[PDB]
Amino acid sequence: XVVX
Amino acid sequence: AASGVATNTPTANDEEYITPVTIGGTTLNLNFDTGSADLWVFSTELPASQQSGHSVYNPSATGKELSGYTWSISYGDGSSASGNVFTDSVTVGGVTAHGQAVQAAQQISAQFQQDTNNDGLLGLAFSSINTVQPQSQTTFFDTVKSSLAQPLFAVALKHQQPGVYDFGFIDSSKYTGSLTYTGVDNSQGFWSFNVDSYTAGSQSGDGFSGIADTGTTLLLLDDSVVSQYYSQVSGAQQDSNAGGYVFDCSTNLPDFSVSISGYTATVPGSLINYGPSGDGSTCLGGIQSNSGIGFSIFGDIFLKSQYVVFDSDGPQLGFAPQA
Ligand SMILES: *[C@H]1O[C@H](CO)[C@@H](O)[C@H](O)[C@@H]1O
């Protein structure tokens, strides 16, 4: 997997 | 003075790190994200079918509603969530924030509906980017910082082992040597710092800026840097099924380092093998493209090699190799  | 230690645990392949948080008496497993400033949780306001497989907050039990306040956030991977707001008591590693704003989800995108590993996010970026409307709220850290022995938090994320979030103190046993500090630019609300140069295996290049983000799984760099790195990995190829560059799991990977205020932060090639691409017999690289955004995201791949101090005084970031 993720990219916050 | 207060201080505390919360233990984090990676999910499969270290895709995310979760830590227990008690909200109004209920413990939820949240993803701590230094890249956003919203504390949002799965709640009883979501459709029953979406509450499945999660620990949920019930606002009516203990929260005080902020009539007319809403929140809505969209993340870098395209996921999003929205809802309403309540104030409640939030406890992290024994440190309690009274009257902390809790963002109860009313709507969540598919990425979140499919992830049963967490019950929401706890943002640790600067409060300047909190999405609550009409008046933004402070992050858990900003709410408690004046009560901590020191206004900082530190993190040790590990590869398939429990790690820690230290609040209000520095545990010197978590790293080797002394910490090296660099200034942070919080103008965009992130813990942004500059690197003076990088070394990708046999190639070195000029500096750039990036953000320290516990909420991003990989190390996302400029395409130029990614190319340079993978040009040294035999048989590396992009696999859209996997999400980027993949290679034979047995490949010897070059190390990646950055020079920060004279300190060389090195990510060993073994930490760059993320794991099974989940597409055949290859493994996914820990380094992937940042999609042309203009800055790098120092995600978990990078973080697993250092003990990092996020200090509100400066503000500044401290780095040292993990012990
Ligand atoms: C963190 O620091 C506080 C303040 O010194 C202690 O009371 C606590 O036990 C922990 O060491």
Short mmCIF file of C-alpha atoms and ligand atoms in Angstrom, two decimals:
data_model
loop_
_atom_site.label_atom_id
_atom_site.label_comp_id
_atom_site.label_asym_id
_atom_site.label_seq_id
_atom_site.Cartn_x
_atom_site.Cartn_y
_atom_site.Cartn_z
CA UNK A 1 1.68 -3.27 -0.96
CA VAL A 2 0.00 0.00 0.00
CA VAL A 3 0.78 3.69 -0.28
CA UNK A 4 -0.70 5.68 2.65
CA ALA B 1 5.83 12.85 32.47
CA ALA B 2 4.45 10.13 30.21
CA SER B 3 6.08 7.74 27.86
CA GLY B 4 5.09 4.35 26.49
CA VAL B 5 5.89 1.55 24.12
CA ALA B 6 3.40 0.07 21.71
CA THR B 7 4.39 -3.16 19.91
CA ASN B 8 3.81 -3.42 16.18
CA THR B 9 3.58 -6.62 14.13
CA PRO B 10 4.00 -7.00 10.36
CA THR B 11 1.28 -8.73 8.41
CA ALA B 12 2.27 -11.30 5.71
CA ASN B 13 5.41 -10.23 3.85
CA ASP B 14 5.57 -7.07 6.04
CA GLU B 15 2.93 -5.49 3.76
CA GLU B 16 1.70 -3.42 6.72
CA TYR B 17 2.42 -3.06 10.46
CA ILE B 18 -0.42 -3.06 13.00
CA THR B 19 -0.55 -1.94 16.60
CA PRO B 20 -3.33 -2.24 19.12
CA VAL B 21 -5.12 0.98 20.19
CA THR B 22 -7.86 1.20 22.82
CA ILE B 23 -10.66 3.59 21.97
CA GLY B 24 -13.35 4.16 24.57
CA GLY B 25 -12.60 0.66 26.04
CA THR B 26 -12.47 -1.29 22.75
CA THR B 27 -9.17 -2.43 21.32
CA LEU B 28 -8.67 -2.12 17.59
CA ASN B 29 -5.67 -3.14 15.41
CA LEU B 30 -4.53 -0.01 13.54
CA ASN B 31 -1.96 0.78 10.90
CA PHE B 32 0.24 3.68 12.17
CA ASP B 33 0.93 5.97 9.22
CA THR B 34 3.49 8.75 9.37
CA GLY B 35 2.21 9.78 5.94
CA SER B 36 -1.31 11.04 6.96
CA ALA B 37 -2.88 12.87 9.86
CA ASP B 38 -6.25 11.16 10.36
CA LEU B 39 -7.13 8.61 13.08
CA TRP B 40 -10.09 6.77 11.45
CA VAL B 41 -11.64 3.45 12.42
CA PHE B 42 -14.13 0.87 11.16
CA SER B 43 -17.39 1.70 13.08
CA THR B 44 -20.92 0.50 13.59
CA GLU B 45 -21.99 3.18 11.04
CA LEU B 46 -20.70 1.00 8.23
CA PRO B 47 -23.03 -1.53 6.53
CA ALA B 48 -23.02 -4.71 8.66
CA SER B 49 -21.48 -6.63 5.78
CA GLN B 50 -18.43 -4.38 5.88
CA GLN B 51 -17.93 -4.72 9.67
CA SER B 52 -17.21 -8.36 9.11
CA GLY B 53 -13.84 -9.57 10.09
CA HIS B 54 -13.05 -6.42 12.06
CA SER B 55 -13.09 -5.00 15.57
CA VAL B 56 -15.33 -1.88 15.30
CA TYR B 57 -15.81 1.27 17.32
CA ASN B 58 -19.38 2.05 18.47
CA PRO B 59 -19.51 5.84 18.80
CA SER B 60 -22.79 5.89 20.71
CA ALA B 61 -21.29 3.97 23.58
CA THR B 62 -18.63 6.44 24.61
CA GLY B 63 -17.90 9.13 22.02
CA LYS B 64 -19.08 12.75 22.04
CA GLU B 65 -20.25 13.66 18.53
CA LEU B 66 -18.94 16.82 16.83
CA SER B 67 -22.21 17.90 15.24
CA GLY B 68 -21.75 18.75 11.61
CA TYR B 69 -18.10 17.70 11.27
CA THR B 70 -17.07 15.33 8.50
CA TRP B 71 -13.85 13.86 7.18
CA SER B 72 -12.86 12.46 3.83
CA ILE B 73 -9.43 11.23 2.77
CA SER B 74 -7.86 9.77 -0.34
CA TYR B 75 -4.49 7.93 -0.27
CA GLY B 76 -1.61 7.47 -2.69
CA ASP B 77 -2.68 3.96 -3.69
CA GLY B 78 -6.21 5.24 -4.69
CA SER B 79 -8.00 4.03 -1.50
CA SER B 80 -10.32 6.43 0.38
CA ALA B 81 -12.60 6.59 3.39
CA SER B 82 -15.06 9.11 4.82
CA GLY B 83 -17.34 9.65 7.83
CA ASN B 84 -18.18 11.65 10.87
CA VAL B 85 -16.41 12.59 14.04
CA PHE B 86 -16.46 11.95 17.72
CA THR B 87 -14.08 12.71 20.59
CA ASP B 88 -13.13 9.78 22.88
CA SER B 89 -10.26 8.51 25.03
CA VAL B 90 -7.51 6.89 22.92
CA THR B 91 -4.76 4.79 24.58
CA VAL B 92 -1.57 3.78 22.81
CA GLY B 93 1.10 1.83 24.72
CA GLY B 94 -0.31 3.11 27.99
CA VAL B 95 -0.29 6.81 26.88
CA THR B 96 -3.87 8.19 26.96
CA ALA B 97 -5.16 11.10 24.89
CA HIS B 98 -8.41 12.38 26.42
CA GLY B 99 -10.77 14.05 23.96
CA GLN B 100 -8.89 12.79 20.91
CA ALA B 101 -10.86 13.20 17.67
CA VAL B 102 -11.84 9.76 16.35
CA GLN B 103 -12.99 9.63 12.68
CA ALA B 104 -15.70 6.97 12.42
CA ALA B 105 -15.94 5.46 8.94
CA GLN B 106 -19.28 5.67 7.16
CA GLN B 107 -17.80 4.76 3.71
CA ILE B 108 -14.61 2.80 2.78
CA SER B 109 -13.23 1.92 -0.67
CA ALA B 110 -12.67 -1.65 -1.83
CA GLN B 111 -9.02 -1.75 -0.80
CA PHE B 112 -10.13 -1.27 2.79
CA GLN B 113 -13.14 -3.62 2.54
CA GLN B 114 -10.75 -6.35 1.35
CA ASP B 115 -8.08 -5.79 4.04
CA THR B 116 -9.00 -7.61 7.22
CA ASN B 117 -5.56 -7.00 8.74
CA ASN B 118 -6.45 -3.58 10.19
CA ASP B 119 -9.41 -1.77 11.69
CA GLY B 120 -8.36 1.74 10.49
CA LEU B 121 -5.35 4.07 10.57
CA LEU B 122 -3.68 6.28 13.23
CA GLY B 123 -2.00 9.23 11.32
CA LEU B 124 1.34 10.53 12.62
CA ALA B 125 2.10 13.18 9.93
CA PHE B 126 1.74 16.89 11.02
CA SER B 127 -1.79 17.95 12.07
CA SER B 128 -1.76 20.60 9.30
CA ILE B 129 -2.95 17.93 6.87
CA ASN B 130 -5.77 16.44 9.04
CA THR B 131 -8.91 16.31 6.81
CA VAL B 132 -11.64 17.07 9.40
CA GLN B 133 -14.05 19.79 8.32
CA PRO B 134 -14.92 22.51 9.03
CA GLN B 135 -12.03 22.68 11.60
CA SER B 136 -9.07 20.26 11.43
CA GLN B 137 -8.17 18.22 14.51
CA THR B 138 -4.84 17.15 16.04
CA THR B 139 -3.21 13.80 15.64
CA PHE B 140 -2.86 11.47 18.61
CA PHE B 141 0.76 12.56 18.88
CA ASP B 142 -0.01 16.29 18.78
CA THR B 143 -2.76 15.75 21.33
CA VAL B 144 -0.35 14.17 23.86
CA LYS B 145 3.01 15.68 22.98
CA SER B 146 3.02 18.31 25.73
CA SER B 147 2.49 15.55 28.28
CA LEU B 148 5.38 13.35 27.06
CA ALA B 149 8.81 13.45 28.74
CA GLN B 150 10.14 14.46 25.25
CA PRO B 151 7.98 15.60 22.25
CA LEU B 152 9.00 12.79 19.91
CA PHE B 153 8.20 9.22 18.93
CA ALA B 154 10.61 6.63 17.50
CA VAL B 155 10.13 3.53 15.47
CA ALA B 156 11.73 0.21 14.85
CA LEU B 157 9.94 -1.78 12.13
CA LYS B 158 11.33 -5.32 11.61
CA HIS B 159 11.29 -8.09 9.01
CA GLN B 160 8.81 -10.75 10.19
CA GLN B 161 9.34 -9.91 13.88
CA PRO B 162 7.48 -7.63 16.32
CA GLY B 163 8.82 -4.07 16.49
CA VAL B 164 8.05 -1.02 18.56
CA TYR B 165 6.72 2.47 18.50
CA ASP B 166 8.44 4.38 21.40
CA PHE B 167 6.43 7.43 22.52
CA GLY B 168 8.19 10.27 24.44
CA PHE B 169 11.60 8.62 24.88
CA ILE B 170 14.45 7.07 22.85
CA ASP B 171 15.46 3.49 23.49
CA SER B 172 19.21 3.45 22.86
CA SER B 173 19.28 -0.34 22.91
CA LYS B 174 17.37 -0.38 19.57
CA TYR B 175 20.27 0.94 17.53
CA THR B 176 23.98 0.84 17.07
CA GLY B 177 26.13 3.90 17.73
CA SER B 178 24.69 7.38 17.95
CA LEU B 179 21.80 9.02 16.10
CA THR B 180 22.45 11.43 13.25
CA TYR B 181 19.80 14.17 12.85
CA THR B 182 18.58 16.03 9.76
CA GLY B 183 16.09 18.89 9.44
CA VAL B 184 12.49 18.25 8.37
CA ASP B 185 10.49 20.43 6.02
CA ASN B 186 6.88 20.07 7.27
CA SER B 187 5.43 22.54 4.79
CA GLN B 188 3.38 19.79 3.01
CA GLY B 189 2.57 18.15 6.40
CA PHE B 190 5.02 15.24 5.93
CA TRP B 191 8.24 14.23 7.73
CA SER B 192 10.24 15.31 4.66
CA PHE B 193 14.04 15.35 4.57
CA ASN B 194 16.82 15.70 2.03
CA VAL B 195 19.47 13.22 0.98
CA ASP B 196 22.72 14.55 -0.51
CA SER B 197 23.45 11.52 -2.71
CA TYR B 198 22.60 7.83 -3.23
CA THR B 199 24.50 4.66 -4.17
CA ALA B 200 22.52 1.93 -5.99
CA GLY B 201 24.97 -1.00 -6.02
CA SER B 202 27.72 0.13 -8.44
CA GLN B 203 26.14 3.46 -9.41
CA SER B 204 26.00 6.69 -7.43
CA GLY B 205 23.93 9.81 -8.17
CA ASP B 206 22.75 13.23 -6.96
CA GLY B 207 20.41 13.88 -4.00
CA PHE B 208 16.66 14.48 -3.77
CA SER B 209 14.00 14.81 -1.05
CA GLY B 210 11.69 12.16 0.36
CA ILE B 211 9.28 11.46 3.16
CA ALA B 212 9.71 8.94 6.01
CA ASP B 213 6.46 6.92 5.73
CA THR B 214 5.57 3.94 7.90
CA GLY B 215 2.33 3.66 5.92
CA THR B 216 3.93 2.77 2.54
CA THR B 217 5.17 -0.77 2.04
CA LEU B 218 8.04 -0.13 -0.41
CA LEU B 219 10.85 2.30 -1.18
CA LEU B 220 9.42 4.42 -4.05
CA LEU B 221 11.98 6.29 -6.07
CA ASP B 222 12.33 8.22 -9.33
CA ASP B 223 12.10 5.99 -12.41
CA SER B 224 15.71 6.93 -13.32
CA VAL B 225 16.91 5.52 -9.99
CA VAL B 226 14.70 2.47 -10.33
CA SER B 227 16.12 1.77 -13.83
CA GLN B 228 19.71 2.15 -12.61
CA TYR B 229 19.06 -0.21 -9.73
CA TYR B 230 17.36 -2.95 -11.80
CA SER B 231 19.85 -2.64 -14.67
CA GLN B 232 22.18 -4.42 -12.21
CA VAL B 233 19.85 -7.28 -11.37
CA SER B 234 20.08 -10.18 -13.76
CA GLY B 235 16.82 -10.94 -15.46
CA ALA B 236 14.76 -8.27 -13.63
CA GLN B 237 11.58 -7.46 -15.58
CA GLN B 238 8.41 -5.49 -14.92
CA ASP B 239 5.39 -7.68 -14.20
CA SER B 240 2.10 -5.75 -14.03
CA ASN B 241 0.49 -8.82 -12.35
CA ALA B 242 3.03 -8.42 -9.50
CA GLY B 243 3.14 -4.58 -9.37
CA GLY B 244 6.57 -3.74 -10.72
CA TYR B 245 9.98 -5.17 -11.18
CA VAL B 246 10.34 -8.84 -10.32
CA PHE B 247 13.33 -11.21 -10.37
CA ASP B 248 14.37 -14.73 -9.51
CA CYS B 249 14.09 -15.09 -5.77
CA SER B 250 17.70 -16.39 -5.62
CA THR B 251 19.23 -13.29 -7.12
CA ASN B 252 21.95 -11.54 -5.18
CA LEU B 253 20.66 -7.93 -4.90
CA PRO B 254 22.91 -4.89 -4.67
CA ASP B 255 22.56 -2.67 -1.59
CA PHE B 256 20.99 0.80 -1.70
CA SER B 257 22.27 3.68 0.48
CA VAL B 258 21.56 7.42 0.89
CA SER B 259 23.82 10.03 2.52
CA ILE B 260 21.87 12.06 5.07
CA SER B 261 23.71 14.93 6.78
CA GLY B 262 26.90 12.86 6.57
CA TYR B 263 25.31 9.63 7.77
CA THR B 264 25.11 6.77 5.25
CA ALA B 265 21.78 4.94 5.66
CA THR B 266 22.18 1.53 3.97
CA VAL B 267 19.42 -0.84 3.05
CA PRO B 268 21.02 -4.29 2.54
CA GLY B 269 20.12 -6.13 -0.65
CA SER B 270 18.43 -8.90 1.44
CA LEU B 271 15.78 -6.42 2.65
CA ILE B 272 15.11 -5.38 -1.03
CA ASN B 273 13.75 -8.88 -1.76
CA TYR B 274 10.16 -8.09 -0.64
CA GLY B 275 8.88 -11.59 -1.10
CA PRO B 276 6.93 -13.78 -3.52
CA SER B 277 5.62 -11.65 -6.33
CA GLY B 278 2.49 -13.78 -6.00
CA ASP B 279 2.86 -14.37 -9.73
CA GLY B 280 4.73 -17.54 -10.64
CA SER B 281 8.23 -18.12 -9.33
CA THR B 282 9.62 -14.61 -8.93
CA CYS B 283 9.94 -12.18 -6.06
CA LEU B 284 8.90 -8.52 -6.04
CA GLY B 285 11.64 -5.85 -5.57
CA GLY B 286 11.40 -3.58 -2.53
CA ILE B 287 12.33 -0.60 -4.80
CA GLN B 288 9.63 0.55 -7.29
CA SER B 289 8.63 3.72 -9.13
CA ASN B 290 7.15 6.77 -7.37
CA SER B 291 5.03 7.42 -10.54
CA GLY B 292 6.70 10.75 -11.30
CA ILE B 293 5.54 12.60 -8.19
CA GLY B 294 8.83 14.57 -7.68
CA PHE B 295 9.86 13.20 -4.26
CA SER B 296 10.69 9.76 -2.83
CA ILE B 297 8.72 7.69 -0.31
CA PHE B 298 11.03 6.02 2.23
CA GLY B 299 8.58 3.24 3.09
CA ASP B 300 8.93 0.10 5.24
CA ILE B 301 11.63 -1.43 3.05
CA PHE B 302 13.92 1.43 4.12
CA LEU B 303 12.63 1.64 7.64
CA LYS B 304 13.30 -1.99 8.41
CA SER B 305 17.03 -1.08 8.36
CA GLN B 306 16.96 1.87 10.80
CA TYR B 307 15.74 3.07 14.16
CA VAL B 308 14.07 6.43 13.31
CA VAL B 309 13.33 9.32 15.66
CA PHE B 310 10.48 11.71 14.71
CA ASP B 311 11.20 14.83 16.77
CA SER B 312 8.75 17.69 16.94
CA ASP B 313 11.61 20.03 18.17
CA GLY B 314 13.19 21.41 14.93
CA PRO B 315 11.40 19.45 13.66
CA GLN B 316 14.02 16.84 12.77
CA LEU B 317 14.56 13.14 12.05
CA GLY B 318 17.21 11.01 13.76
CA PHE B 319 18.68 7.91 12.17
CA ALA B 320 20.89 5.03 13.27
CA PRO B 321 21.22 1.40 12.07
CA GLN B 322 18.85 -0.99 13.91
CA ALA B 323 20.50 -3.21 16.49
C1 LIG C 1 8.96 6.34 29.61
O1 LIG C 1 9.44 7.52 30.27
C2 LIG C 1 8.61 7.89 31.42
C3 LIG C 1 9.13 9.25 31.90
O2 LIG C 1 10.49 9.13 32.27
C4 LIG C 1 8.65 6.77 32.44
O3 LIG C 1 7.84 7.15 33.53
C5 LIG C 1 8.08 5.51 31.77
O4 LIG C 1 8.16 4.43 32.70
C6 LIG C 1 8.89 5.14 30.54
O5 LIG C 1 10.30 4.93 30.85
#
